[PDB]
Paper text:
The cysteine protease legumain can develop asparaginyl endopeptidase (AEP) and carboxypeptidase (ACP) activities in a pH- and context-dependent manner. Primarily found in endolysosomes, legumain is involved in immunological processes such as antigen processing and TLR maturation as well as in tumor progression.
The crystal structure of hCE revealed the typical five-stranded antiparallel β-sheet wrapped around a central α-helix. Parts of the appendix structure (Thr76–His82) were flexible in the electron density map. The legumain reactive center loop (RCL) of hCE exposed Asn39I in a conformation similar to that seen in hCC and hCF, consistent with its suggested role for active site (P1–S1) interaction.[4a] The conserved conformation of the RCL suggests a canonical, substrate-like binding mode that is shared within the type 2 cystatin family; differences in binding affinity within hCC/E/F should be related to exosite interactions.
Residue numbers in the entry: 6 to 76, 83 to 125
Write the structure that this text describes.
């Protein structure tokens, strides 16, 4: 066949390739979001991969708003507390291809947590 569609498989949330895919998702989400502040990953809850012509990562993760405003090393950005605190739970689909340096966030659906 012409198409390459591999098996969908569970990965460890601590797989270094999941982690890189996760930082790709965060960076892209922050670029596209209307929020004043950068969000930052707090927990990878679930991770799956699928071999295509390239690799898809399907990530479920939680994010927290930071004190860092956009107007980047997120490890230096504290999670906001009290009035500015906001938590999201997101599904991300990330595309990784060996000929591109930047991994792409194909889809995302985020949801504000109480």
């Amino acid at each position: 066949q012409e198409r390459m569609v591999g098996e969908l498989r569970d990965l460890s949330p601590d797989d270094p390739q999941v982690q890189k895919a996760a930082q790709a998702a965060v960076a892209s989400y922050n670029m596209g979001s209307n929020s004043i502040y950068y969000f930052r990953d707090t927990h990878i809850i679930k991770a799956q991969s699928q071999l295509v012509a390239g690799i898809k990562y399907f990530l479920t993760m939680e994010m927290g708003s930071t004190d860092c405003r956009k107007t980047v090393d997120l490890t230096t950005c504290p999670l906001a507390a009290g009035a500015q605190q906001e938590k999201l739970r997101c599904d991300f689909e990330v595309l990784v291809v060996p000929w591109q340096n930047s991994s792409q966030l194909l889809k995302h659906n985020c949801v504000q947590m109480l």
